[PDB]
């Protein structure tokens, strides 16, 4: 159908590669395509360069490394639960200084996980994403002392875990103190160690007002750098014998050692820019010609004194400014863990160099790779920033890759995160979305990269601006940091232009975030697009300018929770980003070059390109994502079709002809309905179910192991004791359910028998056995069954057996069986629906079609939304959408309405007039006049001031239609709703929060080891937690017996719960509870602390709650 697009703002540049923040970072860290000798001293190369040479054979040096090819492809890694990784080899050489002997070898170091094409990893079979971390950039900062107004603190910050934070302060007594590792000492001493004399310090710092006198200490200048050095070593290391070389080693390792102290390149740059100096390396000082040499200290002190005095050109630093906060991407983080592992490896190396034969040492003998592999594995498996990939839909993955976290290792510990870190800073503009952040405790701490934003090589976030010269806007685009941006007057992207010239004499601009009205002469730069302000998710909300930000946050976040439907549609009203999202998420298949489609199949598309080569594209079909949603590609071309470069070949999940399809376009009415849409609840039509709207495919994975035991081996088999043919019906010969079988709760998926624990049959068992004369079998039923509330159709089985090719399981495991079960989920009561404007609700009622409100032409609406959900939410976007939807419904067209560049009311009115002619002219042509009920509604509408009195019925109905309102008949009575109702098409998504996955109940079930209280969680068939507050509720009701029951029979009273169950199945009332087991646990644990806790009666005589069982 035709797509009309609104807006006049012409985007000069397209969005950058949306996953480049991952891909380019990791590529930079690995340098795999770079021949060894051409590699830069960055990433893992830099890690190697920091670790080696290893001295005190006497020397082990690093030459180069190489990465081999992955031993297994990605899909295979997903199957066998393997990590997708490449072998890492390092070329090392061992040299004995005296002998001159040189032994060289390439040593295997283990594997390193590889990033897939889409920016993610495969770790032990599961897709993971390394989330970027925001932190304070290294450098030299000056901040106001919160205690002493007029005084300031200098802070020298290096990279995380690459040196201590050093503080310089002017003490109340006038002396300038330095704090390192929580040790306050006079800076004069260190200055002396660096080799400064009173003369130099006087001529350098004398200008400031007497501050320099707090720096003057005769007892410090009366001693040479060595004595000062040892003095400092005593001041920093109490108890440690003040030997010379130990002092030198410690101070060098604290301030000068590049293998231990490291400002980033960013920290170095920032220090240089702030202090107006130049650094040789990235440390605070050097060790040159036997002595220490200053680099940063004197300039820092200079600046501190200058700022304290009031000398112009010196200012404090806003630490939340995005010129002072940077991003650590996957490459950097991984490189850090790699560096740690390498350090451990080096310690191991020196350790081995001390031992063993000293003449027969090879690099292979010295290097144990285990700690490195361990550090890497730990990073990719159990790091905070290494997260289970969200791939509910492609947009989920895309967004997950663009997330920024202030938490994590070296990051902010929560609850120590005040309003400042969580605030939207002015410099977030164009860099970090002001909308997309979590609700609740993570708010402001997890954020999202703005659509046009790019992290630069130093880690600072940059946003694009257009150059403006003499009121003329060039196509030259410059990416700036916030620091750079603060220098210019930057016009808004919606500034009126004739050609490339600014057409208004008053233009809206920013100067350091401050909105200001300026002349075109003053304009230096201009925004590229409104798009650049917001994340990808927020950029998908049409009419965003009409929604309050709090609900925009919700619609934005909820798009990622949308489930791929079997009949998914792109929205009737789009923002124009829906294609780039599909393309960049690598969901869909596109033509590599121009060519002709040779073969089209559900499984594969074969294309013949212009080169004459036949390229075959296999199609991923009914694959299971991390969240169990269906991943499949449908061919969208036919045999013999002529395709150009970049043309669509196959639609992925949530894709409709290359357009992002997160849900369904449905006809909605905005009205109350008998309380069924009370408080955000939603009413829907059964028609939606009838035509499989909001139907989604979900795949669950079940797994079972047969292992070796001390009592005999478990085995997968069909020969399960005491089961009928009815229960074994769908099991194959080997004891595994067949492909295509429908399984329900209780049904066996995989048969398994386990040898019984050494049974001492109770006399009852012996007598019963005698009565029935049947030998008790050696093995028992331990089969994998469908859990309660689950099931569906078996679609795949995987069997891995020990002693078979390519197969080696964990020790003791004989075999592993996996069964995949697919279900087709229809929308049901309790399922969560949402639109892009933050309107969300669960389906409360599914009405038969004859009960739905309907148009005069007999067309029933699909969804009934409550108007009460609008005023206090202030998300009018959804209304406008609906209006446009109405037009689109009758014109058979879709729209692209860009944010802040979207369709305006008048244009929508025009479209609604056009649509009205189709909606009514058809009627008048078919030979029908206006209806009586319509006349009644028109009378009411005249009373409501909605239509002008005097006009004909058609003119008034047209007025209403232009207001987006129509006459609606109650399906139950055939009488019209007394007022005209807003009706139109709306894009609504079904979210992952389905009631099928949430409903859970328990009578009795498994209990905990120590506490003997019910386990938690649906998977463990757990019980609900009756917490402190629920207890308080019962107490406040005075419901003493209910409460005691919760405390005892219902949880952790063993005799009590047993007797209660037996009494209930006998039809007797439940007995009086006794002592909860966790109180006995408490008593014993207090005894273990050597405390004697005694329960006494009223006569102060001990009462034994252990019933003699614990008293000798």
């Amino acid at each position: 159908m035709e797509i009309k697009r609104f807006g006049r703002i012409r985007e000069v540049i397209p969005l950058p590669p949306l996953t480049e923040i991952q891909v380019e970072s990791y590529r930079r860290a690995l340098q795999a395509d770079v021949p060894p000798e051409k590699r830069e001293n960055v990433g893992i190369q830099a890690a190697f360069r920091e670790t080696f040479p290893i001295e005190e054979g006497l020397v082990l040096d690093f030459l180069e490394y190489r990465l081999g090819e992955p031993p297994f492809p990605q899909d295979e890694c997903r199957e066998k639960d393997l990590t997708y990784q490449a072998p890492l080899y390092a070329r090392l050489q061992l040299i004995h200084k005296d002998t001159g002997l040189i032994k060289e070898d390439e040593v295997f170091l283990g594997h390193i996980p590889l990033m897939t094409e889409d920016g993610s990893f495969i770790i032990n079979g599961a897709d993971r994403v390394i989330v970027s971390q925001i932190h304070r950039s290294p450098g030299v900062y000056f901040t106001p002392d919160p205690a002493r107004p007029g005084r300031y603190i200098a802070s020298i910050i290096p990279l995380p875990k690459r040196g201590p934070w050093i503080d310089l302060e002017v003490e109340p007594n006038g002396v300038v103190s330095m704090k390192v590792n929580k040790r306050k000492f006079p800076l004069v001493l260190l200055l002396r160690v660096l080799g400064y004399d009173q003369e130099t310090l006087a001529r350098e710092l004398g200008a400031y007002g007497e501050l320099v006198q707090g720096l003057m200490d005769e007892s410090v200048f009366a001693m040479r750098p060595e004595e000062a050095l040892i003095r400092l070593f005593t001041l920093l290391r109490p108890g440690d014998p003040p030997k010379r070389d130990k002092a030198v080693a410690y101070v060098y390792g604290l301030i000068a050692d590049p293998r231990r102290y490291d400002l980033g390149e960013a920290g170095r740059y920032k220090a240089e820019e702030k202090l107006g100096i130049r650094l040789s390396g990235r440390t605070l000082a050097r060790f040159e010609d036997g002595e220490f040499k200053d680099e940063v200290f004197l300039p820092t002190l200079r600046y501190l004194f200058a700022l304290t005095a009031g000398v112009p050109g010196h200012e404090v630093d806003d630490i939340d400014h995005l010129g002072n906060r940077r991003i650590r991407t996957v490459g950097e983080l991984m490189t850090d863990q790699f560096r740690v592992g390498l350090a451990r490896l080096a310690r191991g190396v020196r350790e081995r160099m001390l031992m063993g034969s000293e003449d027969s040492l090879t690099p292979a003998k010295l290097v144990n790779s285990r700690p490195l592999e361990a550090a890497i594995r730990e990073f990719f498996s159990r790091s905070q920033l290494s997260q289970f990939k969200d791939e509910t839909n492609p947009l989920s993955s895309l967004r997950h890759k663009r997330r920024i976290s202030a938490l994590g290792p070296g990051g902010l510990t929560r609850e120590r995160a005040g309003f400042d870190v969580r605030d939207v800073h002015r410099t977030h503009y164009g860099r970090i979305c002001p909308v997309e952040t979590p609700e609740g405790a993570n708010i402001g701490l997890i954020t999202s990269l703005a659509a046009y934003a790019r992290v630069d090589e130093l880690g600072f976030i940059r946003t694009p601006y257009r150059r403006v010269v003499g009121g003329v806007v060039t196509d030259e685009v410059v990416y700036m940091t916030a620091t750079e941006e603060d220098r210019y007057t930057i016009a808004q992207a919606n500034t009126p232009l004739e050609g490339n010239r600014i057409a208004a004499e008053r233009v809206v601009a920013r100067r350091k975030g401050e909105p200001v009205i300026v002349s075109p002469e003053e304009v230096e730069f201009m925004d590229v697009s409104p798009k650049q302000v917001f994340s990808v998710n927020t950029n998908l909300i049409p009419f965003l300018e009409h929604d309050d930000a709090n609900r925009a946050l919700m619609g934005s976040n909820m798009q990622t929770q949308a489930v791929p439907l079997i009949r998914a549609q792109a929205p009737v009203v789009m923002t124009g980003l829906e294609e780039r999202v599909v393309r960049d998420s690598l969901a869909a298949l596109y033509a590599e070059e121009d060519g002709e489609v040779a073969k089209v199949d559900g499984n594969r598309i074969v294309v013949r390109y212009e080169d004459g080569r036949l390229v075959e594209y296999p199609l991923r079909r009914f694959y299971r994502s991390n969240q169990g949603t269906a991943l499949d590609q449908r061919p969208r071309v036919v045999v013999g079709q002529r395709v150009r470069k970049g043309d669509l070949l196959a639609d992925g999940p949530a894709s409709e002809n290359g357009f992002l399809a997160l849900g369904q376009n449905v006809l909605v009415a905005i009205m109350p309905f008998d309380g069924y849409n009370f408080e955000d609840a939603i009413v829907i039509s059964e028609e939606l179910l009838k035509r499989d709207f909001y139907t989604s495919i979900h795949i669950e994975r079940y797994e079972i192991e047969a292992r070796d035991t001390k009592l005999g081996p478990e085995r997968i088999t069909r020969d399960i004791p005491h089961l009928s043919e009815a229960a074994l019906r769908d099991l194959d010969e080997e004891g595994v359910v067949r492909i295509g079988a429908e399984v329900k709760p209780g049904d066996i998926l995989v048969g398994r028998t386990s040898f019984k624990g050494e049974s001492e049959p109770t006399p009852e068992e012996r007598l019963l056995r005698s009565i029935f004369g049947e030998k008790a079998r050696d093995v028992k039923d331990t089969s994998l069954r469908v859990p309660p509330g689950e099931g569906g159709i078996v679609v795949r089985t995987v069997r891995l057996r020990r002693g078979d090719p390519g197969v080696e399981l964990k020790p003791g495991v004989r075999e592993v069986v996996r069964v995949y079960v697919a279900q087709k989920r229809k929308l049901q009561v309790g399922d969560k629906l949402a639109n892009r404007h933050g309107n969300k609700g669960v389906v409360a009622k599914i009405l038969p079609v004859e009960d739905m409100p309907h148009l005069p032409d007999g067309t029933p609406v699909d969804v009934i939304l409550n108007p009460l959900g609008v005023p206090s939410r202030m998300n009018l976007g959804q209304i406008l959408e609906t209006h446009l939807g109405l037009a689109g419904y009758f014109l058979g067209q879709r729209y692209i309405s860009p944010i802040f560049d979207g369709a305006k009311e008048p244009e929508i009115k025009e479209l609604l007039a056009q649509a009205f002619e189709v909606y009514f002219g058809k009627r008048k042509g078919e030979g029908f006049g206006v209806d009586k009920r319509e006349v009644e509604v028109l009378r009411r509408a005249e009373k409501l001031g909605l239509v002008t009195p005097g006009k004909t019925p058609e003119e008034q109905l047209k007025e209403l239609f232009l207001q987006g309102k129509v006459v609606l008949y109650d399906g139950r009575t055939g009488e019209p709703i007394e007022g005209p109702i807003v009706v139109g098409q709306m894009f609504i998504m079904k979210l992952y929060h389905m009631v099928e996955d949430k409903m859970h109940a328990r009578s009795t079930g498994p209990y905990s080891l120590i506490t003997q209280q019910p386990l938690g969680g649906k998977a463990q068939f757990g019980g609900q937690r009756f917490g402190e507050m629920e207890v308080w509720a019962l107490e406040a009701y005075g419901a003493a017996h209910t409460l005691q029951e919760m405390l005892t029979l219902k949880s952790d009273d063993i005799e009590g719960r047993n007797a209660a169950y037996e009494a209930i199945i006998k039809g007797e009332d439940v007995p009086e509870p006794s002592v909860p087991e966790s109180f006995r646990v408490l008593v014993k644990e207090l005894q273990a602390l050597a405390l004697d806790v005694q329960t006494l009666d009223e006569k102060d005589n001990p009462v034994d709650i252990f019933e003699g069982l614990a008293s000798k």
Binding site: T709, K810, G812, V1081, K1084, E1085, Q1087, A1088, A1090
Partner: protein, 57 residues
């Protein structure tokens, strides 16, 4: 007052610091067992060191 000093350290019942076999046949155990083992090792070594007339340091 002297009871604030320990001569005999109590030992919690084993079921409150279990050594249990999990699904796959592997073992899981409480930290209290490692703390207790540290204690017992150091105590026993102390008794042996006293028995063999070790120096003061």
């Amino acid at each position: 007052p002297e009871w604030m000093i320990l001569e005999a350290v109590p030992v919690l019942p084993p079921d409150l610091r279990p050594m249990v076999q999990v699904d796959g046949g592997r073992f899981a155990t409480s930290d209290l067992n490692d703390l207790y083992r540290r204690l017992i090792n150091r105590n026993n070594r102390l008794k042996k060191l006293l028995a063999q007339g070790a120096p003061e340091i």
